[PDB]
Amino acid sequence: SLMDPLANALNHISNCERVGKKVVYIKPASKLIGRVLKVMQDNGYIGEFEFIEDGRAGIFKVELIGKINKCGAIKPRFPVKKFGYEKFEKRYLPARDFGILIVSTTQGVMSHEEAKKRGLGGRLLAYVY
RNA sequence: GGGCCCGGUAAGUCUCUUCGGAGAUACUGCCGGGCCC
């Protein structure tokens, strides 16, 4: 069985970043994945990225910039309250002071830091440091 | 068998609460469609 779309996207990025590649093409291109990439971008973890129409689910061309040390999907997508992030930050960001949790809120996908800044709880979907 | 999208829902979930419920709707689920492999 194939790995879920988002997990898959984060795995490829992770590795092509490690190997030093300057680009990666992510196959399944869901709105969710795009939304997650937007967060990683706004946080300086990846460069430009674009949707490439292919008649299927689409494709994401992501510009890597050697800013990622590791990233992946969080499974299951744990629910988190407005003040329950710390517990998760210790669990997925091995490095204190570095990284973000990407959470899905009723107001959209964003970093846990913006979710807190807004008093929103949500679903954990990934980590990046 | 797998995946993408649209509309609906609001069980899970999040927020608030007079703690009865109310509001929200991204994710999961559910209903109805479109489509790709």
Q: How far is CA A15 from CA A20, A59, A82, A108, A112, in A?
A: 8, 18, 32, 27, 24
Q: Are residues A104 and A115 in the same domain?
A: yes
Q: Are residues A100 and A123 in the same domain?
A: yes
Is the CB of residue A76 inside 7 Å of nucleic acid strand B?
A: no
Do A74 and A98 belong together in one domain?
Answer: yes
Q: Identify how the structure was determined.
A: X-ray
From A18, A42, A68, the end of a domain falls on A68
Last residue of a domain, one of A18, A33, A68: A68
Show the domain range for A79.
69-129
Quick count: other Cβ atoms within 10 Å of Cβ A110? 23
Residue ranges in chain A assigned as alpha helix (H)? 5-18, 31-42, 85-92, 112-117
Contact A34, A21 (CB under 8 A): no
Distance CA(A33)–CA(A37), nearest Å, equals 6
Question: What resolution, expressed in A, was reported for this entry?
Answer: 2.6
Going by C-beta distance under 8 Å and a sequence separation of 6 or more, which residues neighbour residue A56?
A: none
Q: Do residue A81 and residue A102 come from a single domain? A: yes
Q: For residue A63, give both structure tokens.
A: 């510009």
CA A64 to C1' B33 (Å) is: 38
Q: How far is the CA of A35 from the C1' of B27 (A)?
A: 12
